[PDB]
Amino acid sequence: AKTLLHKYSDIPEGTECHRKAYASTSIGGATGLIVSAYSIALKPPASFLEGVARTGRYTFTSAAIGAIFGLTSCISAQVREKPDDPLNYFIGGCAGGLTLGARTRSYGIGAAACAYMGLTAALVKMGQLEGWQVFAEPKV
Amino acid sequence: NVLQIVRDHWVHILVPVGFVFGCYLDRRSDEKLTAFRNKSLLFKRELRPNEEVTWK
């Protein structure tokens, strides 16, 4: 539910790198499990063993991406000594994209994932700073 | 030949008629923005003895 997001957000950005990495790993694992369940439901490959292999690889890939993103972003935030800077989230997103490319083993997916994940992470950080709303409440 | 060229050249009068109609519409639309006629703080003028409006 929203408990994992609260766990990730409660930690200060510039401290507790291991806890941030654990929270990001949990979020990535949950997303990987959900996408694996959808893939299994819509495309039953051949049997139980292939299905469990596919769900395991998807969950591991997503968890690795999340862990790398969290660790890199927190490390950059601490080292630069400048929190609330979207540049740290951009570096984290590009690192996550790089691990996605390494897991898929093709340079094109790695570069595209770096670009389009650093951009998304930077946008998320900017929204958190400025209070951008995705699901806006019905004011008027 | 009268009443014969009309059936072939009646289309030429369309554009000038449209122009005249547009001029009339412009004047009529200008008639709706007279809320400050002769009340501007710069062009405030006393009317002539035989003048009713500053501009039309």
Add this chain to the structure above:
Amino acid sequence: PFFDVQKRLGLDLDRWMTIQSAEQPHKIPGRCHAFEKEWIECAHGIGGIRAE
């Protein structure tokens, strides 16, 4: 959406079954007749937000 034909015509097609306290046969009372009556009278003609 909701075309209130009933209130326009005063037909009462389906309004008798809406609540517990509305003209039960043989005047058999609901188990929570008093509470429902109190809440309905509290929230009548007040609007959804203010009633809540």
Add this chain to the structure above:
Amino acid sequence: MPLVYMNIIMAFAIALAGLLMYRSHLMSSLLCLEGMMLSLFIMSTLIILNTHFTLANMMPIILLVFAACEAALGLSLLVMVSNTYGTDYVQNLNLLQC
């Protein structure tokens, strides 16, 4: 909220899961639908009788009637499927695809 209502909602959820699992035998799908309907009838009857909402005693019967009608309709469709294929396996309905 006592345990009886919890058990009835659990039965409805189990029947819904059985309907959505879809092993084979579309007749089993219809059976799952009607199990869901029976759970609905039991729950509504208990709720209405508990609160002495007299005028609402009509609601279950009406419900049942309509639902049974749907069941009949469903059965008809099933029959036609078999008459086109010789059997009612769910996997045979794959002519139309996204």
Add this chain to the structure above:
Amino acid sequence: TMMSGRPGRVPLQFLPNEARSLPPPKLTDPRLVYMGFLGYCSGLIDNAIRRRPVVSAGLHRQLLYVTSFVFFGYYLLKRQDYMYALRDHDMFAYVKSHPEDFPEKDKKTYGEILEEFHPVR
């Protein structure tokens, strides 16, 4: 805005009685002329689809299209004007009834207001 639950509303009235207190749209209204133009376009398209002389196939049919469109446009314009008048009336009544939420702004002059100047170089 959601004026659906506005008190004292007849459930299925196109034009309430109070809507008669507003000036009706002129018969030469530009919007009514636009509805007439839409009717004429519908007539031309109808002639085109049926494979008939587009300009001069059915004069009665084109006239009926124009008249129906003008009729519906007139009534729709009346309803639109009434609804907008209702919205403005509710706005003004609410702003009058709640002076605390709409305080009078302390009118100020540009002479005693400091706006930062950003030179262009």
Add this chain to the structure above:
Amino acid sequence: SSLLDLIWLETILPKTTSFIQMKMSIMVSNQKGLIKLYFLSFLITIMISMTLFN
């Protein structure tokens, strides 16, 4: 002319978009038409909305 205008500027904005949308269309529209998988996905999304959005 060739390397920037005809190769990389084409690869970045239009060609990448075309490739991504083609791949997504192929992924989404490839359904065998089995209602077994459809209703399994329906159950999955019912569970997800029940436990996530509350």
Add this chain to the structure above:
Amino acid sequence: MLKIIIPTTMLLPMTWMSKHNMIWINATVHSLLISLISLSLLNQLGENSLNFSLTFFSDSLSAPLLVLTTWLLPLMLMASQSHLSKETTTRKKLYITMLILLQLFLIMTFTATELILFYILFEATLVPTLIIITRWGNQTERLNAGLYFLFYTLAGSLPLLVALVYIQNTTGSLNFLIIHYWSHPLSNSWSNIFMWLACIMAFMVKMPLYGLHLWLPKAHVEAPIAGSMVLAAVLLKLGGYGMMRITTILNPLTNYMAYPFLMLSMWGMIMTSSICLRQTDLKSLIAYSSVSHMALVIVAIMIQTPWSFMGATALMIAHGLTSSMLFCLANTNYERVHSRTMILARGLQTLLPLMATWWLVASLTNLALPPSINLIGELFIITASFSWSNITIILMGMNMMITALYSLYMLITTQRGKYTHHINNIKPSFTRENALMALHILPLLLLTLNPKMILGPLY
């Protein structure tokens, strides 16, 4: 303004009820008559504007563009009269209808006192152009060109709608007068940065900016002649006009948000000028020249100084006329040759001397020769950019030299040299083409006498 909009509308029933062999005559005559009516708008005053009504207003920025738009249509008809000979009456009438609709949309766009109406017509100008490109196009790549032209524009302009409605929600009005009078500074924030990007990108994509210009060579090459002239002359100026109208609310953010676009334009002018040198096609060469000139206009607008704006307006008008002339000449060559390749037909000056004269005059005007308004706008922008920074002169001078080089290369390859031996269908030039070139060029040499009419509101 309705004295202009109404006759343009009446052009449609006039065309559709004309005889089968007299549509061109009527359309040309009444289009020219309309242009004369549009001439009255040019007499602007040093004060605010000619506020006609609540919906339309005219400035000294809108007046030259409006006059050029009204003047272009007769030339488009004379250009299209050639390749539509074997076309049915209904399709020719549909073509003229598309041209008239395009002119009407542009006329309503250029005044558009409210920004949402401006955006609505600014996107409405996209349908007739796409229909013209994809329907009456020769090559098989017209479909891809139409798709590129549609999507490049729409992707950029879609966030603009959101930005505009947001501005209306906060500011409370989108009328340009109120927007100008009540303007307030934009604070340096991420939200304001993205508002700036949304409001700017929609106009920068259409100009086009270097890096987003991929749609322009395709659209210009695959389109028919009339589509080519309307793209190069007027449709490119929509972005610049919108940018000069909308930069009134983006200060002082622009002071540092202009760096990426300034660098992109100041390098893309050099890149496209160099590209023009090594080109196997004429229309592609002219399209890249248009890209270079529009990049210079982008630099001028982003500098945001009075001389920048004056030079931008002058360059807009001059480039429109020059590019239209060049596309006309290329089309006349292609009609006889049927190949559209620069080196396939050579030495045409020996066979067609007057067309060689027209080629020389068009190349000289494109070369920014004094005292033509091309060089007036060029020099104003050069001085303004020099005031902005002393190092821009290097890039601008390099662009000038390369521009001269590729202009004279275009002239020499097609006009000088020995004629190609195996071409024997170079018929003498008709009176229509000579009249078209004369009507293209004479307004330029006439406007060089009264520059103040095209120098914009900051004159």
Add this chain to the structure above:
Amino acid sequence: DGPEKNYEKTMAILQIEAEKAELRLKELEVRRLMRARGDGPWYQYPTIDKALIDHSPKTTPDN
């Protein structure tokens, strides 16, 4: 025509647009307050009518 015509037309147009902008801001604020509180004619979601209640002896004193 003379400059006074354009001058006064512009003044009238400016007044109209300024009034419209102020009215739009007021409308947005009024809508926000009305939806937040619910004490105005707008955003009045229906409730149960109280004319449906039966006020009669119910065969049981305690209702």
Add this chain to the structure above:
Amino acid sequence: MNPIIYTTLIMTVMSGTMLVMISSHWLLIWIGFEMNLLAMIPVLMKNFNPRATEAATKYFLTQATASMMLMMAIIINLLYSGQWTITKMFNPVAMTMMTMALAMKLGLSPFHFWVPEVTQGISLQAGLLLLTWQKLAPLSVLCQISQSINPNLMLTMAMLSILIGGWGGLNQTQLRKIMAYSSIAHMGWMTAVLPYNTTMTILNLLIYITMTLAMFMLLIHSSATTTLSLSHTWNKMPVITSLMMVTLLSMGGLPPLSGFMPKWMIIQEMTKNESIIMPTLMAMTALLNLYFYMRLAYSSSLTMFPSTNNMKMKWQFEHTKQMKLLPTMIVLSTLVLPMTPALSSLN
């Protein structure tokens, strides 16, 4: 079937929808849904064939599951508050389940899978009725309880619906599947503005109904089901292809055509509630709908595909049956932008 029986079934479908819209009791609304489903099935099976039977059984299964979920939600709402009137839901679980039930009935993703197949199996006339008329009851019910719906669930389902419709429309070749995905995307657009302003929902519904009625009537007029069968049309009735291309451009959201009115207006409303990211995303997504509409227009009218010899014989015969209201539908779906403020009529 017999014309009298067909008319009776159509009257019963309309009566069920009317009963859903004009009733203030949850049980009566459920009864109206059941009547609609019961009478709608033979309309799909008017032209008997295996494809029609399979489509009808898929539709029946989906609708029956949705109705059972709706009844369970009604039961829970009654349990936690002894109220039958359709008003604030008074319970989160009941609201969630009723939202899923109405999503299943409407066709919003991820419950969208049945729409393309049901539209493909059944005929054009059946498809036209299913695509436009069916939406009126669930949309009315959703509008009646919009103050209780959770914005997160509705907004995410609408976004997913827009994405799925846009992506799935690119691949399809048959016109009926293209229409199904177009309907999915339009409903994703329309249900996103439910929490904010239901008037925009009704306006978008009316505009979409007009556009899809015009397009389906044009497809029936020129009896084409696949893309190539439509490409052959220009050789006989070019006017139909031109009108269809104009309507397709309108359906893509291109101004100044009528199809731009809803999207624009909808965006405006979500900008009043400080929702900026989502309208931008839905616009860039509707670009995909525009793309496949443009591809269809390229195939149909803007280019002349090769014809067939036998088509010569079709030149001599005229369309015997003319469907009334087609010109009106085209005009209303193409040239009604200047009358946008009439949406204040609370249509």
